[PDB]
Enzyme design. Structure first.
Site, mmCIF file in Angstrom:
data_model
loop_
_atom_site.group_PDB
_atom_site.id
_atom_site.type_symbol
_atom_site.label_atom_id
_atom_site.label_comp_id
_atom_site.label_asym_id
_atom_site.label_seq_id
_atom_site.Cartn_x
_atom_site.Cartn_y
_atom_site.Cartn_z
ATOM 1 C CG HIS B 41 -0.350 0.215 2.520
ATOM 2 N ND1 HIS B 41 -0.223 -0.802 3.444
ATOM 3 C CD2 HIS B 41 0.154 1.324 3.112
ATOM 4 C CE1 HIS B 41 0.348 -0.331 4.538
ATOM 5 N NE2 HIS B 41 0.589 0.954 4.362
ATOM 6 N N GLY B 143 3.072 5.532 10.195
ATOM 7 C CA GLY B 143 4.409 5.416 9.659
ATOM 8 C C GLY B 143 5.167 4.178 10.086
ATOM 9 C CB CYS B 145 3.137 0.546 7.328
ATOM 10 S SG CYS B 145 1.535 1.161 7.932
HETATM 11 C C1 LIG Z 1 -6.280 3.237 8.072
HETATM 12 O O1 LIG Z 1 -5.102 3.165 7.261
HETATM 13 C C2 LIG Z 1 -4.844 1.998 6.599
HETATM 14 C C3 LIG Z 1 -5.811 1.230 5.942
HETATM 15 C C4 LIG Z 1 -5.438 0.046 5.297
HETATM 16 C C5 LIG Z 1 -4.103 -0.338 5.315
HETATM 17 CL CL1 LIG Z 1 -3.576 -1.818 4.516
HETATM 18 C C6 LIG Z 1 -3.136 0.417 5.963
HETATM 19 C C7 LIG Z 1 -3.491 1.595 6.605
HETATM 20 C C8 LIG Z 1 -2.451 2.411 7.320
HETATM 21 C C9 LIG Z 1 -2.370 2.093 8.813
HETATM 22 O O2 LIG Z 1 -3.256 1.427 9.354
HETATM 23 N N1 LIG Z 1 -1.288 2.576 9.486
HETATM 24 C C10 LIG Z 1 -1.067 2.389 10.863
HETATM 25 C C11 LIG Z 1 -0.488 1.247 11.384
HETATM 26 N N2 LIG Z 1 -0.286 1.055 12.719
HETATM 27 C C12 LIG Z 1 -0.658 2.005 13.554
HETATM 28 C C13 LIG Z 1 -1.262 3.220 13.144
HETATM 29 C C14 LIG Z 1 -1.647 4.215 14.078
HETATM 30 C C15 LIG Z 1 -2.232 5.385 13.643
HETATM 31 C C16 LIG Z 1 -2.455 5.596 12.260
HETATM 32 C C17 LIG Z 1 -2.093 4.647 11.329
HETATM 33 C C18 LIG Z 1 -1.484 3.431 11.748
#
Ligand SMILES: COc1ccc(Cl)cc1CC(=O)Nc1cncc2ccccc12
Ligand SMILES: COc1ccc(Cl)cc1CC(=O)Nc1cncc2ccccc12
EC number: 3.4.19.12
Lengths: 306, 306
Positions: B41, B143, B145
């Site tokens: 993504h 961030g 990810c």
């Molecule tokens: C809603 O955003 C999506 C949807 C689908 C996909 Cl596959 C990835 C994402 C990005 C994501 O969730 N990032 C985060 C991963 N861990 C913690 C997080 C804490 C706060 C904000 C984002 C965080």
């Protein structure tokens, strides 16, 4: 989101751990520049530990009696000296993996990461706090002596602890990197008393702020309190008294959550008197005191290091 | 003595983390040999996340649209491909810090260390378990990810997890290093249901054995039980059923403590029905299930790594 007992990345410290052997005793050492630091009881036998005269024992040792191994790299000792409770071994090779570092003596209540080591090799890393009675509740086996505790600020590794001994009560005692013990302990095998262990109140408050940040709000009450009335209840439950310096440190967390420090103290006062009644906070059924205000900000804002 | 939630030393993994930028999205990548692994993504915008067609989005990208930074070292992408939910970027330089590694898909209940990273730089390390519903209760911010989970067996780093997303419920989901999600989740911004989260019974038993090793014995009772009668009570409290494979795995801990597995199950049955009554085990007021039998043996015997 989420909250974990998080340790610093240990890569910069793993490259500094060496194996120190004197006669038949083998423990861990810290190799910075061309000096190796290790507990001075490496020069003792099992019988010496009951009442060691370190000065007399060290005089019977020469440079060639110390064997320092960095994996398979053999370091040659060209000078030795005793500084308080640590031995400083001057070697012929400077550590190419020496990071930016400093030696710091921490205060009770501060937290650090421990890199537990055996025979110079890393076993694991965990986070702990220096208790108010200058012990730590670590995880150590025989041979872990010389394992170090540390913090990282950006590119600088601050070494603050060197493990020396396990007390008969199962808690752990050690020194700073200048060889001065934390607390009233001495490096000999004898019964030694650690004082009353109290709960680090400013840390508990920081953890309650972390809970609010992460969505746990059930403990927030409508009452308030004063600093003197809170400390009267805190001291009844063996909690450290809260001072104005503690209130100033909690400032940034009060701002982020919109909850005044004294208001959070009132919530804590009710948790102390009424308990938690089978509920949990951040996945715990006990009040947690191993997170400083800085740890909470660091984890909830994403501070990184080199 | 002592018992801590201990993570693996992260040095071997810190040298593999890089920053991956495509257009305006920046996340973490894993650099092994001349290939960089990162969540697919990274090629999406904020609007694409609601219903992304990854195949159509990836076709609009070329090799020069990806920017990979290893601190200040710029890696040049010379080939890209999509394997399930991960992107594989072929670069021109092989990572000189590549350790012995393998890719492993773990089972629920197994534990691993997470190296939380932001912009390619390490923030902290912690230990967690894969829940029975294939989520993890991590600590992640925006961030993070591309942060990876791993175990170390001797000199080999087994990568088992890559972080992809936080669910609206605050728990975390990701893939193995071949891009296959753990659980039924998909990488799009939509409400997704995680199943019932149950307690990992074999891990709770391993932790009770650790408590006995460390001197906590108050929960040991005089009663015994059978495997069928225990599972009848365990399933009532949302505990995983115990099988004979679990009993075989707990063998070495039974031998060390002299407490039969079925006898320990009887102690657990009384803890489930009667509670702990304000007492603690290993400094915890809840039954802990994030330690495998291997973790207990490793911590209580002092297994080290390269
Ligand atoms: C809603 O955003 C999506 C949807 C689908 C996909 Cl596959 C990835 C994402 C990005 C994501 O969730 N990032 C985060 C991963 N861990 C913690 C997080 C804490 C706060 C904000 C984002 C965080
Ligand atoms: C009683 O042995 C003395 C006395 C005095 C001093 Cl100065 C040092 C020591 C060595 C020591 O305590 N080692 C250990 C340090 N951590 C954990 C230990 C767990 C099991 C066995 C030894 C452990």
């Amino acid at each position: 989101s989420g909250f974990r007992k998080m340790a610093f990345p240990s890569g910069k410290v793993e490259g500094c751990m060496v194996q120190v052997t004197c006669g038949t005793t083998t423990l861990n050492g810290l190799w910075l520049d061309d000096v190796v630091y290790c507990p001075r009881h490496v020069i003792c036998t099992s019988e010496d530990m009951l009442n060691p005269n370190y000065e007399d024992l060290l005089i019977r040792k020469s440079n060639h009696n110390f064997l320092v191994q960095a994996g398979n790299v053999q370091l040659r000792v060209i000078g030795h000296s005793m500084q308080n409770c640590v031995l400083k071994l001057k070697v012929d090779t400077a550590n190419p993996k020496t990071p930016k570092y400093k030696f710091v003596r921490i205060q009770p209540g501060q937290t650090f990461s421990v890199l537990a080591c055996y025979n110079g090799s890393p076993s694991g890393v965990y986070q702990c706090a220096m208790r108010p009675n200058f012990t730590i509740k670590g995880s150590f086996l025989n041979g872990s002596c010389g394992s170090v505790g540390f913090n990282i600020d950006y590119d600088c590794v601050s070494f603050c602890y060197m493990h020396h001994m396990e007390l008969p009560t199962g808690v752990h005692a050690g020194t700073d990197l200048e060889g001065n013990f934390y607390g009233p302990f001495v490096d000999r095998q004898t019964a030694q008393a650690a004082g009353t262990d109290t709960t680090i109140t400013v840390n508990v408050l920081a953890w309650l702020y972390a809970a609010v940040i992460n969505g746990d709000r059930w403990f927030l009450n409508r009452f308030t309190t004063t600093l003197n009335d809170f400390n009267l209840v805190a001291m009844k439950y063996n909690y450290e008294p809260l001072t104005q310096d503690h209130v100033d440190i909690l400032g940034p967390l009060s701002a982020q959550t919109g909850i005044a420090v004294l208001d959070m103290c009132a919530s804590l006062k009710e948790l102390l008197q009424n308990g938690m009644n089978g509920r949990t906070i951040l996945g715990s059924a006990l009040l947690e005191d191993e997170f400083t205000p800085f740890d909470v900000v660091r984890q909830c804002s994403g501070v990184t290091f080199q």
